Amino acid sequence: MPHAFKPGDLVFAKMKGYPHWPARIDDIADGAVKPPPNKYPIFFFGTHETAFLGPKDLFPYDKSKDKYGKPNKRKGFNEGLWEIQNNPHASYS
Numbered sequence: 001m002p003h004a005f006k007p008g009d010l011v012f013a014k015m016k017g018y019p020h021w022p023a024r025i026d027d028i029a030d031g032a033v034k035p036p037p038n039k040y041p042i043f044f045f046g047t048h049e050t051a052f053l054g055p056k057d058l059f060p061y062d063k064s065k066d067k068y069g070k071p072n073k074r075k076g077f078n079e080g081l082w083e084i085q086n087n088p089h090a091s092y093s
Contacts, residue, residue: 002060005040010061010088012068013042013053020059020068021077022084026050046080048092 005011005025013023022045028034035041039052059068061084069085071078083092 005055005058008089010084011042012059012061012064013044013051014057014059015051015053019072019074019077020064022046022061022069022080023058024084024088025058043092044076044080045083045088045092046076046078048076 007025007027009025011023011025012020014020023042024045026041026043028041032041035052038054040054040058041050042053042058043050069081071081083090
């Protein structure tokens with residue numbers, strides 16, 4: 001049975017106008033801008049962008065990889081696929 005999301009959880013994260021994108025729940029570093037209530041800081045692999053998402057847009061990686069874990073035409077996407085598969089917990093700063 002699922003827990004709530006925690007820092008380090010890998011997901012595909014859905015934003016409007018983007019395909020489900022390889023992403024992880026980032027930790028909030030000392031001194032970093034905190035998310036709004038009920039939002040997680042999402043670090044998107046490949047683009048290395050952050051956005052704040054709620055769980056409705058967060059699809060746990062292992063369950064969803066069969067569906068979303070396929071190359072995409074979009075910038076940084078396949079790079080993102082490599083990172084989530086090969087080194088999801090590294091520093092990309």
